[PDB]
Design a protein around this ligand. Structure first.
Ligand SMILES: [Mg+2]
Ligand SMILES: [Mg+2]
Ligand SMILES: [Mg+2]
Ligand SMILES: [Mg+2]
Ligand SMILES: [Mg+2]
Ligand SMILES: [Mg+2]
Ligand SMILES: [Mg+2]
Ligand SMILES: [Mg+2]
Ligand SMILES: [Mg+2]
Ligand SMILES: [Mg+2]
Ligand SMILES: [Mg+2]
Ligand SMILES: [Mg+2]
Ligand SMILES: [Mg+2]
Ligand SMILES: [Mg+2]
Ligand SMILES: [Mg+2]
Ligand SMILES: [Mg+2]
Ligand SMILES: [Mg+2]
Ligand SMILES: [Mg+2]
Ligand SMILES: [Mg+2]
Ligand SMILES: [Mg+2]
Ligand SMILES: [Mg+2]
Ligand SMILES: [Mg+2]
Ligand SMILES: [Mg+2]
Ligand SMILES: [Mg+2]
Lengths: 153, 201, 402
RNA sequence: ACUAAUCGAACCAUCUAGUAGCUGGUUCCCUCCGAAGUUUCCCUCAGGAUAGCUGGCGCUCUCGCAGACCCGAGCCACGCA
RNA sequence: CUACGCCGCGACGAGUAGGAGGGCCGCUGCGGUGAGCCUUGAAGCCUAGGGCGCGGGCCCGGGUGGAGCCGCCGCAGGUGC
RNA sequence: CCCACUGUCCCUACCUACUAUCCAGCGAAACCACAGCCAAGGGAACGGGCUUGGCGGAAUCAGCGGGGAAAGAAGACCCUG
RNA sequence: CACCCACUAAUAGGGAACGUGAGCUGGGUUUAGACCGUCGUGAGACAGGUUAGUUUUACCCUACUGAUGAUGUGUUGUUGC
RNA sequence: GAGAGGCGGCCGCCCCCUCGCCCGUCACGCACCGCACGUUCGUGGGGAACCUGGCGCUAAACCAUUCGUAGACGACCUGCU
């Protein structure tokens, strides 16, 4: 498969991927941007804290109607949320990437998420029923997620 | 010129001085105008007060906090007058506006510097002696300015210190003219050179 | 076209930023005009709204119906423990306003005052003013402090004192003290600096600032009411019952032109918690606070010369939502902005009091101390026990304990 | 009123690509020339025919062409405005 | 001196509706022609690559792609948004 | 019209359930030349853009009904055919 | 509009798309039902009377109301102008 | 010297040169062979990083928890050996 942003050296690097994952693209894009550049141990703790609503992700681009929170002040922002499904999907991808790191023989305590990217998957069509005998789409917005972790300490 | 042009605002007509200043800052020159309360405006005081009170009336009916900003300090009145002569909505006019600084009274950075004068904007030469005029300090004070009194006392203190400095300058020049008599025989060799070339009549 | 019938507008436009106050304490915003002929005195104080009660007094207003008659009047008790002076600020008059020339604090700043400088006193290492207090003892620093006082003596027009409340003497949860600048009036800058310097670290009671039956001004923040609609915020007319989208609204928010909504139209938003000043609040009493000479002296708080009853300003069962008033207090007349235990600024009146309503001596005949936690009907514990006699709880109390 | 969510004449298919002086649209470049809203007639007045204004294709002629270089050697084109 | 070529001199240059000319402008297919191009890489597509033309457009470099395509002389259109 | 009755009103207040609000999950539609601060001017005689001035400070949340001569329908009134 | 009662210091006159319907109401006007008078042969008509008659959408931009924030003084806090 | 002092002045000790100012004597310096951006403020401002000596310092903010003087959510008032 073709990753965007091939690593500067594919020997201190590990890759993880997921296609057609059933999480909201907008939520996962904000969550991925928060953990970008993080250490893998810091990111795992952070994504667990998002599930417990102890640290939020800052909704920076897709922030229409997103409410305010006190935990957005850790970042330089005002709006934040705690997307549980986006955090769990990225936690599984972090686990898969870490197991790939072990298979490549490089230690997992120096890994940093140097690349992460969320693309839009093909939408899945459902149906809703409206007032005057009308039908409107009820589409889902899945996403492809890819990541690259590199050793640096 | 590359230096900073400091102008004394006393006795200067408002728009006459503002026109000269506006062209100066457009030519890349830094201009400082001090004693903006000494600027005069042609026409009797009641006439000029009516002009500014009409300006106070012009405000945004929907939200006056967005409307015209009426600045009551004489420095800010002169600053806004110069702004009306610049293309202040372009980057060139904004840069020119940044080269101009205005002060009520004379602050300590400029009170020890010799102050220039624009003859083309002076009331003595640009106005007939029988015509009435108003003072920008009085006009501003009677329309909302809050610091006519404190600027008055600080200007008196500055003038007291300047008188002392001037009497030291007089004492120095008196000594220098006396010196030119004391060393007269060993100076006339260089004095005759000066006289034949116009300097030192 | 013109509206059919004339009607005054709802709500004053003099309070138009109808927003939550940026401050909780309430700043003075105007001190009384300084005249050097008067003696050196303070102009402000900090108190805490304890509660309300009512009094009985004899009116001495000639020509009125209530002349030589007894009236009752609501009063507000404001607990005012003595302030502690911890610093001096100098100000110099400039053509741009007053600007702080130099601030000199004192040694031994109290812990309660030092909590004001910390958002999190718990995790703090309490390092505030640790190096500043060291220059009050060395040689070069002490000489520098003298230079600061001399330059304040020759360049400053108005000086103020930083004073803080002793929050430890109050029954409140809060321990962090409230700092405030109080302008020193009545004298030359040298004289008021000499006065303010010898009051450093000293306690200034409310006795020295305010006097009996004078009109003062109370500055504070009103009770917050949250977001509110136009009928509660601006008291506009409620629309009829038949209205479709709702009746607690303003029907027209502007004409077609000027094609915008004006700032003068009543709209829904934050109500309450506004910074307000109220002038001409008379001081009916300055209480003495609890003392101990041989026993606990409590009588003088609410014992008028006509009552002669040993009781304090505290109602039966304590002030509701506040606690027990133990320090000095000021008994203002009428209502005062703010909730209970809200910090209030008391300021000398800017005006000149010449009317007969002012400068009228107040002689209290009775101070009500019934329970405000319901329909109280007894003034003291002793009166309640005497009226009702022994109860079952006391009957078994003497049985179990002999 | 109702006659399958259709009724002052249902629905389905065809005649049918019904007709429209009326509305909307009408697809590459450069060069040259370049208007009319006026006359007369029409159940003509939101349209046509007709003359006028426009472009294109020409045709019939006129002044002559000049001296290889250089060098004119009363009279000066049909006709038009 | 491709006489449908080349050269000289003088004056001129607005343009809707509209008319006309030129197009070595462009698309598709047929007849001839290029002892044309092409798996040592066609068409198509992408390109901060080099240019030509007043313009319609065109040529060339690089990448991708994987089997067909183009110039010139005529012919014919379901030929340009 | 009268009696009684009452929050229809003077003159509004408080309370309760469900919402709205914030969050986890899920997730549309209308509409959209470009867009979106004003005063005056002139202009298809009522500008978001143009002239002249006032000025202009990221990203947003809850409301709101002044504007967008807001959206919804090739005006059903009137006239023409 | 008018008129009258009553109080009052006075009960002045007007504009803002004859201000103000995604603010309301729908009494009037101004569809379809119906009655009367007049006109008309009739279908039907009447700035004649009368009665019953669906009032839709804001979550967009701005305006406004509130609410976080943002730029700069190294970070941060207190007191302040 | 406080108006925005962001500056200026006066002494005492020490070490240096009798030079630097004018008119003259005396020769020398890359004299780079006609040529531009030369000359200064200036050791300029701003950002990281390395080496080098001395003097020094050892903190807060936010989240989480709590408060309810606050509150749609943020924010705010608060407490925590
Ligand atoms: Mg929104
Ligand atoms: Mg439905
Ligand atoms: Mg259905
Ligand atoms: Mg009126
Ligand atoms: Mg008013
Ligand atoms: Mg209704
Ligand atoms: Mg009670
Ligand atoms: Mg057809
Ligand atoms: Mg006929
Ligand atoms: Mg037409
Ligand atoms: Mg042309
Ligand atoms: Mg076709
Ligand atoms: Mg406008
Ligand atoms: Mg139509
Ligand atoms: Mg129609
Ligand atoms: Mg109207
Ligand atoms: Mg409207
Ligand atoms: Mg409506
Ligand atoms: Mg009706
Ligand atoms: Mg009807
Ligand atoms: Mg009949
Ligand atoms: Mg009748
Ligand atoms: Mg009915
Ligand atoms: Mg919402």
């Amino acid at each position: 498969v073709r990753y965007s942003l091939d690593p500067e050296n594919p020997t201190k690097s590990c890759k993880s991927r997921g296609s057609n994952l059933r999480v909201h693209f907008k939520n996962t894009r904000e969550t991925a941007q928060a953990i970008k550049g993080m250490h893998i141990r810091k990111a795992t703790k952070y994504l667990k804290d998002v599930t417990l609503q102890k640290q939020c992700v800052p909704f920076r681009r897709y922030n229409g109607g997103v409410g305010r929170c006190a935990q957005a002040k850790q970042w330089g922002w005002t709006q934040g949320r705690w997307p549980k499904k986006s955090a769990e999907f990225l936690l599984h991808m972090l686990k898969n990437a870490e197991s790939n790191a072990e298979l490549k023989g490089l230690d997992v305590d120096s890994l940093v998420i140097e690349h992460i990217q969320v693309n839009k998957a093909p939408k899945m069509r459902r149906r809703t029923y409206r007032a005057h005998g009308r039908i409107n789409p009820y589409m889902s917005s899945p996403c492809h997620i890819e990541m690259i972790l590199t050793e640096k300490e | 010129e590359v230096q900073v042009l400091v102008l004394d605002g006393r006795g200067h007509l408002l728009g006459r001085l503002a026109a000269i200043v506006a062209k100066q800052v457009l030519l890349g020159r830094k201009v400082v105008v001090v004693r903006c309360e000494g600027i005069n405006i042609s026409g009797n005081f009641y006439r000029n007060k009516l002009k500014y009170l009409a300006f106070l009336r012009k405000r945004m009916n929907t939200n006056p906090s967005r409307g015209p900003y009426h600045f009551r300090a004489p420095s800010r009145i002169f600053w806004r007058t110069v702004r009306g002569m610049l293309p202040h909505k372009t980057k060139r006019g904004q840069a020119a506006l940044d080269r101009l600084k205005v002060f009520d009274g004379i602050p300590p950075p400029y009170d020890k510097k010799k102050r220039m004068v624009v003859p083309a904007a002076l009331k003595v030469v640009r106005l007939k002696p029988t015509r009435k005029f108003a003072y920008l300090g009085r006009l501003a004070h009677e329309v909302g300015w809050k610091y006519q009194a404190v600027t008055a006392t600080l200007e008196e203190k500055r003038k007291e210190k300047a008188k002392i400095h001037y009497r030291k300058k007089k004492q120095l020049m008196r000594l220098r003219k006396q010196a030119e008599k004391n060393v007269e025989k060993k100076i006339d060799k260089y004095t005759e050179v000066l006289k034949t070339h116009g300097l030192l009549v | 076209s013109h509206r059919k019938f004339s009607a005054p507008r709802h709500g004053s436009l003099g309070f138009l930023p109808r927003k939550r106050s940026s401050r909780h304490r309430g700043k003075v915003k105007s001190f009384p005009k300084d005249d050097p002929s008067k003696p050196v005195h303070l102009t402000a104080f900090l108190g805490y709204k304890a509660g309300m009660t009512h009094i009985v007094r004899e009116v001495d207003r000639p020509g009125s119906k209530v002349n030589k008659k007894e009236v009752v009047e609501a009063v507000t008790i404001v607990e005012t423990p003595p302030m502690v002076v911890v610093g001096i600020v100098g100000y110099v008059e400039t053509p741009r306003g007053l600007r702080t020339f130099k601030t000199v604090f004192a040694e031994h700043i109290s812990d309660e005052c030092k909590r004001r400088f910390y958002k999190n006193w718990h995790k703090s290492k309490k390092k505030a003013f640790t190096k500043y207090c060291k220059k009050w003892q060395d040689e070069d620093g002490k000489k520098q402090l003298e230079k600061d006082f001399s330059s304040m003596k020759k360049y400053c027009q108005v000086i103020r004192v930083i004073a803080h409340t002793q929050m430890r003497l109050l029954p409140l949860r809060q321990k962090k003290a409230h700092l405030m600048e109080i302008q020193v009036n009545g004298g030359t800058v040298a004289e008021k600096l000499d006065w303010a310097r010898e009051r450093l670290e000293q306690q200034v009671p409310v006795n020295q600032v305010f006097g009996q039956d004078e009109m003062i001004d109370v500055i504070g923040v009103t009770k917050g009411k949250g977001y509110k609609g136009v009928t509660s915020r601006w008291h506009t007319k409620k629309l009829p019952r038949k209205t479709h989208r709702g009746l607690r609204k303003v029907a027209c928010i502007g004409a077609w032109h000027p094609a915008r909504v004006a700032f003068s139209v009543a709209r829904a938003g934050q109500k309450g918690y506004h910074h307000r000043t109220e002038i001409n609040k008379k001081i009916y009493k300055i209480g003495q606070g609890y003392l101990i000479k041989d026993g606990k002296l409590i009588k003088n708080n609410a014992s008028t010369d006509y009552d002669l009853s040993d009781k304090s300003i505290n109602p039966l069962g304590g002030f509701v939502h506040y606690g027990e008033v133990t320090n000095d207090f000021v008994m203002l007349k009428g209502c005062v902005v703010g909730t209970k235990k809200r910090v209030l600024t008391l300021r000398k009146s800017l005006l000149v009091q010449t009317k007969r309503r002012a400068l009228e001596k107040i002689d209290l005949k009775f101070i009500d101390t019934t329970s405000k936690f319901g329909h109280g009907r007894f003034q003291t514990m002793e009166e309640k026990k005497a009226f009702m006699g022994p109860l079952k709880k006391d009957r078994i109390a003497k049985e179990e304990g002999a």
